[PDB]
Symmetry: D2
Subunit: 345 residues, 4 copies
């Protein structure tokens, strides 16, 4: 009673490797209806199904310069079943440009009673049947987001254990259905903590994640990790260089992520488009041994400038697509250490 | 940042105590559509909504002799929103007879990959909103069933840990919504294992359950436990007395269940009606100290003869209700150690 | 492959029940040489082997009024091999008065690196052989003390897990050698935390303790628990009644201690002689259901006045023994709820 | 509350890297008195301190061809304080040849009650003081051996958790004293299980080991791992190539051992001299990515021919040393993948 056959393992490993192939990263376009509404609101655009469709089309149909930059695209359920103006389903559009289609499958955070505002994430019910259908409809990987926060009593032992366990359940169900799970334990940058505190918490969270994945018999070669970079908190007064951020990030990963993991696809969080590229580039130039692909799974850091240039106006299509292409090319170079605009750990 | 206020704790504790008050147990009538279908096929009756309504009505409207016997009734979702012939919602029927209304909220078992046929249970998604709605609609306690199996390499560490964890998540969400959770970690009797193997596994499962409930800040006084009795496997060749089953059961509970737990409501599993009554009565006569109510949460051990006597025929209503009443009375006496058919310590 | 046979289980259960039989508790006299030195220093007495022997003799040979009060006596290694003036080994003196002999077997606390001053406890190496010898030499139960502290980031997950685990190892070894283990996870009263914080930490620690005992296959009927009472911190500004202390303590125990545990023998900690008796009495009068004996395992709360009355002078023997008898009698009444000098909010 | 300062970290990391520098491995000569007795008995030699000293001297004073092969030497306590014929302490002999001195610090296995013959390991009591003394006396790394067995119900959850936890306690204490800990969770080859069963158990054990090291705040860059290679059981009838053994071994390590671990020093266990060299060579030629040194920490695989050529006779000194030197050279090439005498299926 092994969880997976050699054939199933090969399929998962091959998918995971395609997504993070050299020079490639992930466009994270899986904002739910409530979250994308706030993005559209920031440009005074109504949150209609058509406006959401057109915006996703804008990103997915950028010119072929993005093909070598984008190994995967994460979609929200609605977008997976939408079509471009030429009638092609968006999964077909993505594949025709050399991309793997991903689907976000979690159903949001819920409060953990007895904690200081901590959450876990729901979405396991009927997940297997959903994954089998998503697989039939063109998806080959999935995403599940857990959220943790650095504070006085947080993240607590309960929150670390519970989020690690539910990530492992999600990963197990995905792999039974031919879907590569992206494991996203995000530690929010909120607060005034410093770099080494983020590093400490990240190390503890990731140790818990991989012990849980082991307990649940997860095939690591058929997974990806989507962590926060190790950074000071948003309100931290002490300032750090990108090389220090890179060193703390790579050290934390080296202390917790088994080499069998196929790749690490960083979330951009609250970083600017340039900051996310500079940090990712510094991570890839960090002189330590890094036995996994180190690339991007960016939302805002790929979309910010495209969203503004668009402004909800059809005539700004080309201008908006150019901004996205410029960030896709930048981060493709960053994940190779080719982008130009220690014992203390 | 405590999970619950003193007012919320009092509500949950008062509910839990009402359900298992002396002489009272639970009617477990929460079979899902697929499971009740098998019950109806066994008496050649069609599985229609009306036949399900009629059958549930048959149990819930039995004469007032059941009132001091039934502290609680577990319903399936459909039944919570059905009505008796007089137009009364079934929850109002139950309450008017002194019972607390329960709702089963799990969404069935699912396979754990990498195990020898082991499962966990799903049903957490949107559970808080469901509990708030069920509370509004008259439910005060809930049920969630996890299933474990004694076998070669089972129950495994993973299966024990995961089922305990999901039970604790369910219990936490229930208590946030004023619903008393019934925690049901059922160890099936399938297999040829002997009595002391069942006792060992039951002790290990219950220790994991209560550590998980602690980790998730569960208020034990506002919970009930629905375990298997400790019995040999169905295929075991060695035979045991009811006194030995009782001693093994009470010993396992005394080694694992904190006295703050308000009550233990046993499942009947594959036991016959009489066997389940005799065993419960022996459990209550066991001379060891037992700091929780020890009563019943019975499905087939309350229903089997009523279902048969009914046979799907409206003219058999009174005869079917009489069979149910008889088992309700029997088990009311058994959960007091007062049941009669007339109506070594360190070896464990 | 059960850990114990029915015969080994009966032996352990019988011992545990003798120690905590109704009206009985434990004299904890197992201060090591460095700790008893501070006690003798407090009365201007030199810390010699003979002064330690004499002081322990004073306690162990008090008159027969203590016999129904004292179910057990915990000794330090040295004392287990000392003799009274009549030539009798101290274990024989204890047994002759109806007491079970206990031996402290831990080797003190050690720091946990990476923690905010937290410790675990050492003493497992060669413990099985030590237990076998102690059993031959008249001991039937043992004691092992872990120490946890309430503070900003303490007790940490690491400290709770590690102390629970080492207690389980100790208990397992003891039970293989016919010794009933007393499991002592002391949460110190140091600090300004309030009563509900102590209750919260005590509930979490004891849940960890009993999960570890389960994982290690410990026979609970052949164990005793020696916990702190649930009290405010020593420096807490909010004040509480003995009844609140009792309610918080009994509630924490009811939420964590399986009924199979044979007895709970409270440590006195920093409490005065009278405070420790009043609190134990209030615990036994608490109206909730308590399915285990609730009695005492007291050091200073049985010894403080005896030590002062002695003052190191052999001519104060009887006066000092009288002070210990008075506290033994007080606490025997208290563990029955017979001593006189909403639960949903917990 | 960080466990170590940057300076303490630098020292441990520097030591760890010196031991497993390219081409180098470890001579494991830390057999205790009882275990070396079995070795000497197999060559008809009396187990006296002098014969133990002479045999250890024979190994430690082998000619300078072993200097680039031997990065560290593990000694038993007795040997750390013995001297060569010329009066030089053995630690000075080792260092004068470019070797780091190691000390075995565990006190052997003890049974876990309630298990099917499983053990944990003892040795924590007073370990901090022992480590500080050993550091003073020339040791810079240590070894602690836990033993697990593949059987019907083994290794159990209890055995895995407890051995991982005690290994982490040992590692923590070592690092507080400037000693690099070698963590040895040996899964025995006993039994008739196949290669994938060993791989499965090895992955589960190592995942538990590294979670425990994380919980105890262990600095992984200042540690080494001494695991079993992944092999079929001794009584398994199915046959495997060295390339399959290598693939299963590297796959297991890639799934569990964080890249920050400085090196993996395989135990030889029951393997012959040639088999252990050939397997280590195939491990280093395995085409998968390996972010740690993969070298040897060998006892009998370095000593077997030398012990037999010696036969307890002083006049066989040079013939015996020659056999040891030949195996040090062989394994130095093997840990470089230069010794000569589908992946989804794992
Ligand atoms: O809860 P929902 O809004 O439905 O899901 C989310 C939540 C956060 C996200 C963040 C993203 O950017 P990045 O931080 O991954 O780079 C991209 C997509 C995201 C989708
Ligand atoms: O999965 P479902 O069938 O929908 O839910 C179930 C499963 C098992 C049951 C067993 C019962 O009898 P007892 O074993 O509690 O006495 C009573 C109700 C039950 C309901
Ligand atoms: O560390 P050592 O000194 O060797 O052992 C101790 C430590 C604390 C003690 C406290 C006591 O009083 P109580 O708290 O048990 O009532 C009695 C004996 C004690 C012995
Ligand atoms: O129990 P003790 O005898 O005191 O210690 C041991 C036990 C096993 C050993 C195995 C060795 O060979 P290898 O398996 O490390 O290659 C070398 C030294 C060993 C020492």
């Amino acid at each position: 009673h092994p969880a997976l056959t050699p054939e199933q393992k090969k399929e998962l490993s091959d998918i995971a490797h395609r997504i993070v192939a050299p020079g490639k990263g992930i466009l994270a376009a899986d904002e739910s209806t409530g979250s994308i509404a706030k993005r559209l609101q920031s440009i005074g655009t109504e949150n209609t199904e058509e406006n959401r469709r057109f915006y996703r089309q804008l990103l997915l149909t950028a010119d072929d310069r993005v093909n070598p930059c984008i190994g995967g695209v994460i979609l929200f359920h609605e977008t997976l079943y939408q079509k471009a103006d030429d009638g092609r389903p968006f999964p077909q559009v993505i594949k025709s440009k050399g991309g793997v289609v991903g689907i976000k499958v979690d159903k949001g955070v819920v409060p953990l009673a007895g904690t200081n505002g901590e959450t876990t994430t729901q979405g396991l019910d009927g997940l297997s049947e959903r994954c089998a259908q998503y697989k039939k409809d063109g998806a080959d990987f999935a995403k599940w987001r857990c959220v943790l926060k650095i504070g006085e009593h947080t993240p607590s032992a309960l929150a670390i254990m519970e989020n690690a366990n539910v990530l492992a359940r999600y990963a197990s169900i995905c792999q039974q259905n031919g879907i590569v799970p992206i494991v996203e334990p995000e530690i929010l940058p909120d607060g005034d903590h410093d770099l080494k505190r983020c590093q400490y918490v990240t190390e503890k969270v990731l140790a818990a994640v991989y012990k849980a994945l082991s307990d649940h018999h997860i095939y690591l070669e058929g997974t990806l990790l989507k962590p926060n970079m190790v950074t000071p908190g948003h309100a931290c007064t002490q300032k750090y260089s990108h090389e220090e951020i890179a060193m703390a990030t790579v050290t934390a990963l080296r202390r917790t992520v088994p080499p069998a993991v196929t790749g690490v696809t960083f979330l951009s969080g609250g970083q600017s488009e340039e900051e996310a590229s500079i940090n990712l580039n510094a991570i890839n130039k960090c002189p330590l041994l890094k036995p996994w692909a180190l690339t991007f799974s960016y939302g805002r850091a790929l979309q910010a400038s495209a969203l503004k240039a668009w402004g909800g106006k059809k005539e700004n299509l080309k201008a908006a697509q150019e901004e996205y292409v410029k960030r896709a090319l930048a981060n493709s170079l960053a994940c190779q250490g080719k982008y130009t605009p220690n014992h203390a750990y």
